[PDB]
């Protein structure tokens, strides 16, 4: 079409980081099928969204105000600071008051209504029919004892969000012709065979092998591999998994296509090589490197899918099976029970995952029965939304489209606040979808387009994977495009700015990394080289401003080249600082960002996100363990940015400043906090905060099995908020060393008010998380499968079961954690010292 449309597809390609019109690494048209398929869902949502609210994207929650936040409001009054150039009043408000109805208690209380309240220095609005106590920014300020500063100004023009117009009962068999690799001369000559598996929801329905042969640059067999399973019995979503054993290579091919047709014809698939379980193994995409990759040739020639009340003790066996964690293995007995009492099972939403693990997906009639089961879904459709449960049906174990769709059905009812909490994991979850186009993928696209905040992170979460996952960049790219084609020219403009910026800093970051070895030091030479490179961008290259990717509410302006530098650490990360591009800003404090290479940030994001879930969990029990999950977004391979927490120091650096360089003293920390405390009130506040934050992290860290940390990866704010960092990748359950204890007023396994307060918070926090054992267990395993390398689909994922002390009662749990606390006391500084 118009040269205009080509220039647009060019722009999109740049934002995405992939050409979705590319057909270099495909063997069918699913992707294209999918691009077209998403048009409707896109358009249906664009069309449905209120142009006004979409432009102002208010950030609101339906959850009640925690108890620990009402404490700061013991007068049913809240002070809002309304600025107006040099003006600035202080209208006292009621937590129930609406933004439109405090703008009344202003305009009239002072004395024309085409105005809207906006947070000073931010792109955050307090609009919409919502209690001011329900806006997040407001709760952010209460939780941090900050004043609410707002500016009266004109609503953003929803015209700016304009969208560009668009325009057989035979047995199954497969013939393995042979394998080919360009170069293979290796050490000791080993043997090699091909394993052809038919899988569904990671479950082998049938398995056939070829005879062992000499591993040469070309091995042929020309042998038909026949399976017992009928062509009429293959389940949609079934995957023909082909692997080469010496396991060296793998590759999958959807047995039924996106059009319900049985795969047929000759295929030459370029395989993935295992690096000397995880999501990546389930991919329907083929290695893009056709030149230096192993490949397997095959031939397919064969469309389809054209009362009784439980006795007392059996219902008991059933209920026990249902109460077991999601990691409890299911016995044949168990599956037969769940299946036979198929309809009783159907009354227990918590049984759903276990029940669908009990279906024989390899049997046409049974699956057939299963669908009839899901038909009478009344109970499920009326169940109180259980995210944990919903996610479980979205993991690697369920490949069935109808099973997965009901989980998504449940997600529909999440308010935006909630989608943000799980947004990163839901996105990862897409690696578990058998087809590109899926209910999940559509959910995301929708939720994205309907709210700007959610689309923004969706953008970056997808970009993250598209830039470094060979196994899923294709699918993720088609989804992202879809989104881009509907977020709005405005968004499309912001993204452009953000992409050019980080794309420059990434180049400088890497080039600088070359001019520096590993041996920590950092010379003025390398810093001089940085300042020069930045100077160059400061010119006509680096846009005037851009949104901070991990904090869309913040607009960043020009670099403060004088405050930038290269950090003296193993990796050589940039420490940039920018001026806030918002005049209405309430400060002159710069925005500090860290650009690093060497670490896999996608992992970091995952932990950080799980950390925020843990917060919300503790919220619903009136707890605030003061964690500090800083901004973090992986932008490419082993590269990305990190929010610079203001006024914080490494606990190691604190020790180093007192004792030797590579040298440990017990009072260092307490000394540091007191000297950093402006008054005695704030110093006492900071010891408090330390006790809470210390317990939060000791608990969060224990559950996620990443508590045994080195001193240089644990920070603390001058205000006392302790917090770990770099979750890149004798023992101790967590870090609770003598110096942390000293701050609490105890030493040599003694006692004190603070230490007992600490132990109280820990246990309270710990059993609060056990109240969500299932939600966490499912987040932990999905994390392991889409974030780590080859995670043991057993022992690894199983840690969290023992950590959350599954099975034990609350008393034995509390007992259990307190003992963990003692193991830290007995170890003192042993482990810290050892960390080398």
DSSP 749-801: S---HHHHHHHHHHHHHHHHHHTTHHHHHHHHHHHHHHHSSS--TTHHHHHHH
Half-sphere exposure of 787 (CA within 13 A, CB side): 30
Give this entry's resolution in angstroms: 3.2
Half-sphere exposure of 240 (CA within 13 A, CB side): 29
693 is in an annotated binding site: no
CB 363 within 8 Å of CB 235: no
Q: Sort strands 249-254 and 218-230 into parallel, antiparallel or unpaired.
A: unpaired
CATH number of the domain bearing residue 89: 3.10.20.90
Residue after which a domain boundary falls, among 167, 199, 217: 167
CA distances from 696 to 295, 364, 815, 823 (A): 50, 50, 18, 18
Residue after which a domain boundary falls, among 167, 197, 232: 167
CA distances from 130 to 60, 72, 112, 165, 717 (A): 8, 20, 22, 33, 34
Half-sphere exposure of 557 (CA within 13 A, CB side): 13
CA separation for the pair 280, 57 (Å, rounded) = 35
Question: DSSP letter at 293?
Answer: S
CA separation for the pair 644, 577 (Å, rounded) = 9
CB 783 within 8 Å of CB 609: no
Closest alpha carbon to 732 in 805, 825, 604, 657: 825
Looking at the structure, tell me whether residues 374 and 504 fall in a common domain: no
748 is in an annotated binding site: no
314 is in an annotated binding site: no
Looking at the structure, tell me whether residues 350 and 407 fall in a common domain: yes
Q: How was this structure determined?
A: X-ray
Query: Which stretch of DSSP H or E encloses residue 364?
Result: helix 364-375
592 is in an annotated binding site: yes
CATH number of the domain bearing residue 639: 3.30.1010.10
CA separation for the pair 733, 430 (Å, rounded) = 33
68 is in an annotated binding site: no
CATH number of the domain bearing residue 186: 2.60.40.150
CA separation for the pair 446, 202 (Å, rounded) = 28
Looking at the structure, tell me whether residues 665 and 796 fall in a common domain: yes
CATH number of the domain bearing residue 374: 1.25.40.70
727 is in an annotated binding site: yes
Looking at the structure, tell me whether residues 150 and 172 fall in a common domain: no
Largest CA distance in the chain: 90
Strand partners, 270: 295
Looking at the structure, tell me whether residues 640 and 675 fall in a common domain: no
Looking at the structure, tell me whether residues 803 and 690 fall in a common domain: yes
Q: How many CB atoms lie under 10 A from the CB of residue 79?
A: 10
Q: Sort strands 714-717 and 639-643 into parallel, antiparallel or unpaired.
A: unpaired
* Residue-range definition of the domain harbouring residue 34: 1-167
Strand partners, 83: 88, 151
599 is in an annotated binding site: yes
Query: Which stretch of DSSP H or E encloses residue 31?
Result: helix 30-48
216 is in an annotated binding site: no
> Residue 385 has which token pair?
């939304």
Looking at the structure, tell me whether residues 460 and 501 fall in a common domain: no
627 is in an annotated binding site: yes
Q: How many CB atoms lie under 10 A from the CB of residue 55?
A: 20
494 is in an annotated binding site: no
448 is in an annotated binding site: no
Cβ density class 780-793: b for 16+ within 10 Å, e for less = bbbbbbbbbeebeb
For the packed helices 416-429 and 439-450, what is the interaxial angle rounded to 10 degrees? 140
CA separation for the pair 806, 324 (Å, rounded) = 9
Residue ranges with strand state E in 620-700: 632-636, 639-643, 648-650
471 is in an annotated binding site: no
Looking at the structure, tell me whether residues 152 and 214 fall in a common domain: no
The 3-state secondary structure of 469-492 reads: CCCCHHHHHHHHHHHHHHHCHHHH
CA distances from 232 to 172, 255, 704, 781 (A): 9, 12, 44, 34
CB 277 within 8 Å of CB 784: no
CA separation for the pair 119, 83 (Å, rounded) = 10
256 is in an annotated binding site: no
CB 739 within 8 Å of CB 668: yes
Q: What are phi and psi of 465, to 5 degrees?
A: -75, -40
Looking at the structure, tell me whether residues 444 and 508 fall in a common domain: no
CA separation for the pair 797, 786 (Å, rounded) = 12
- Number of domain units in the chain: 5
178 is in an annotated binding site: no
Q: Where do we find the tokens 């080195």? A: 710
Looking at the structure, tell me whether residues 625 and 686 fall in a common domain: no
Looking at the structure, tell me whether residues 509 and 546 fall in a common domain: yes
Q: Sort strands 148-153 and 78-84 into parallel, antiparallel or unpaired.
A: parallel
Residue after which a domain boundary falls, among 142, 167, 192: 167
Q: Where do we find the tokens 């296509």? A: 257
CA distances from 306 to 236, 259, 262, 580 (A): 12, 11, 11, 61
488 is in an annotated binding site: no
CB 597 within 8 Å of CB 569: no
CB 56 within 8 Å of CB 125: yes
634 is in an annotated binding site: yes
CB 512 within 8 Å of CB 533: yes
DSSP 422-472: HHHHHHHHGGG-SSSS-HHHHHHHHHHHH-HHHHHHHHHHHHHHHHH-TTT
Closest alpha carbon to 567 in 609, 523, 522: 522
Looking at the structure, tell me whether residues 173 and 89 fall in a common domain: no
> Residue 425 has which token pair?
């994991």
631 is in an annotated binding site: yes
Q: 794 Cβ partners below 8 Å, 6+ apart?
A: none
Q: 473 Cβ partners below 8 Å, 6+ apart?
A: 18, 465, 466, 467
CA distances from 557 to 73, 547, 682 (A): 36, 9, 32
Question: DSSP letter at 735?
Answer: -
């Amino acid at each position: 079409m118009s040269e205009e449309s080509q220039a647009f597809q060019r722009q999109l390609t740049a934002l995405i980081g992939y050409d979705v019109t590319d057909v270099s690494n495909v063997h069918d048209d699913e992707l294209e099928f999918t691009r077209r398929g998403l048009v409707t869902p896109r358009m249906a949502e664009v069309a449905s969204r209120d142009p006004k609210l979409y432009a102002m994207h208010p950030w609101v929650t339906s959850k009640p105000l925690p108890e620990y936040l009402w404490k700061k409001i013991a007068n049913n009054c809240i002070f809002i600071v309304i600025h107006r150039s040099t003006t600035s009043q202080t209208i006292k408000v009621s937590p129930d008051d609406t933004p439109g109805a405090i703008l009344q208690s202003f305009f009239t209380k002072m004395a024309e209504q085409d105005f809207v309240l906006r947070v000073c220095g931010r792109d955050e609005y307090l609009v919409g029919e919502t209690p001011i106590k329900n806006f997040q920014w407001v709760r952010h300020c209460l939780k941090n004892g900050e004043e609410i500063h707002v500016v009266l100004d004109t609503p953003p023009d929803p015209a700016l969000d304009e969208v560009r117009k668009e325009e057989c009962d035979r047995k199954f068999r497969v013939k393995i012709r042979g394998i080919d690799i360009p170069v293979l001369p290796r050490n000791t000559d080993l043997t090699v065979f091909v394993e052809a598996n038919i899988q569904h929801g990671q479950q082998v329905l049938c398995q056939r092998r070829t005879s062992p042969k000499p591993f040469t640059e070309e091995v042929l067999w020309n042998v038909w591999l026949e399976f017992s399973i009928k062509i009429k019995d293959l389940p949609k979503g079934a995957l023909l998994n082909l692997q080469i054993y010496c396991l060296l290579y793998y590759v999958n091919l959807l047995l039924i296509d996106h059009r319900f047709l049985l795969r047929r014809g000759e295929y030459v698939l370029h395989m993935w090589q295992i690096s000397g379980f995880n999501a990546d193994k389930l991919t329907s995409a083929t290695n893009p490197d056709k030149e230096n990759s192993m490949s397997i040739s095959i031939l397919l020639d064969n469309h389809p899918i054209a009362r009784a009340e439980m006795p007392n003790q059996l219902r008991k066996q059933l209920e026990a099976i249902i109460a077991t964690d999601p990691l409890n293995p299911l016995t044949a007995e168990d599956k037969e029970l769940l299946w036979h009492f198929r309809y009783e099972s159907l009354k227990h939403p918590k049984a759903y995952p276990k029940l669908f693990s009990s279906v024989k997906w390899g049997q046409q009639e049974i699956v057939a029965k299963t669908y009839q089961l899901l038909a009478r879904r009344e109970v499920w459709d009326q169940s109180a939304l259980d995210v944990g449960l919903t996610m479980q049906l979205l993991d690697c174990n369920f490949s069935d489209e109808n099973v997965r769709a009901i989980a998504v059905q449940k997600l529909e009812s999440l308010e935006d606040d909630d989608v943000l909490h799980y947004l990163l994991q839901l996105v990862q979850a897409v690696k578990f979808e058998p087809y590109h186009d899926s209910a999940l993928a559509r959910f995301l696209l929708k939720r994205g387009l309907r709210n700007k905040r959610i689309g923004h992170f969706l953008f970056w979460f997808l970009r993250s994977e598209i830039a470094q996952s060979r196994h899923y960049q294709q699918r993720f790219a088609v989804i992202l495009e879809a989104y881009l084609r509907g977020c709005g020219t405005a968004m499309l403009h912001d993204f452009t700015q953000q992409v050019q910026v980080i794309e420059m800093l990434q180049k400088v970051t890497l080039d600088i990394k070359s001019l520096s070895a590993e041996k920590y030091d950092v010379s003025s030479q390398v810093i001089s080289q940085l300042k020069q490179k930045l100077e160059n961008l400061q010119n006509s290259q680096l846009p005037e401003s851009f949104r901070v990717p991990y904090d869309p509410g913040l607009k960043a302006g020009a670099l403060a080249i004088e405050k930038c530098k290269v950090m003296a650490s193993k990796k050589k990360p940039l420490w940039l600082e920018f001026k806030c591009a918002d005049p209405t800003a309430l400060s002159n404090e710069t925005i500090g960002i860290i650009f690093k290479h060497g670490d896999d940030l996608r992992q970091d994001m995952l932990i950080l996100q799980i950390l925020r879930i843990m917060e919300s969990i503790w919220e619903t029990e009136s707890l605030d363990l003061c964690l500090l999950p800083y901004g973090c977004i992986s932008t490419g391979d082993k590269i990305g940015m990190i929010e610079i927490v203001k006024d914080a120091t490494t606990i190691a650096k604190i020790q180093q400043s007192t004792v030797g360089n590579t040298g440990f003293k017990d009072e260092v920390l307490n000394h540091w906090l007191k000297e950093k405390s402006p008054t005695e009130e704030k110093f006492q506040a900071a010891v408090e905060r330390f006790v809470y934050s210390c317990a939060g992290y000791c608990v969060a860290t224990f559950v996620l099995g990443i508590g045994d940390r080195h001193n240089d990866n644990i920070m603390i704010t001058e205000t006392g908020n302790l917090f770990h960092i770099d979750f890149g990748h004798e023992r101790v359950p967590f870090v609770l060393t003598p110096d942390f204890l000293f701050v609490m007023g105890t030493s040599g396994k003694k006692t004190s008010p603070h230490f007992q307060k600490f132990q109280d918070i820990c246990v309270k926090a710990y059993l609060a998380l056990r109240h969500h054992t299932n939600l966490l267990i499912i987040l932990f395993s999905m994390m392991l499968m889409t974030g780590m390398p080859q995670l043991t689909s057993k022992e690894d994922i199983e840690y969290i079961r023992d950590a959350l002390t599954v099975g034990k009662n609350e008393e034995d749990a509390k007992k259990y954690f307190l003992d963990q606390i003692e193991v830290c006391r007995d170890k003192g500084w042993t482990v810290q010292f050892n960390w080398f």
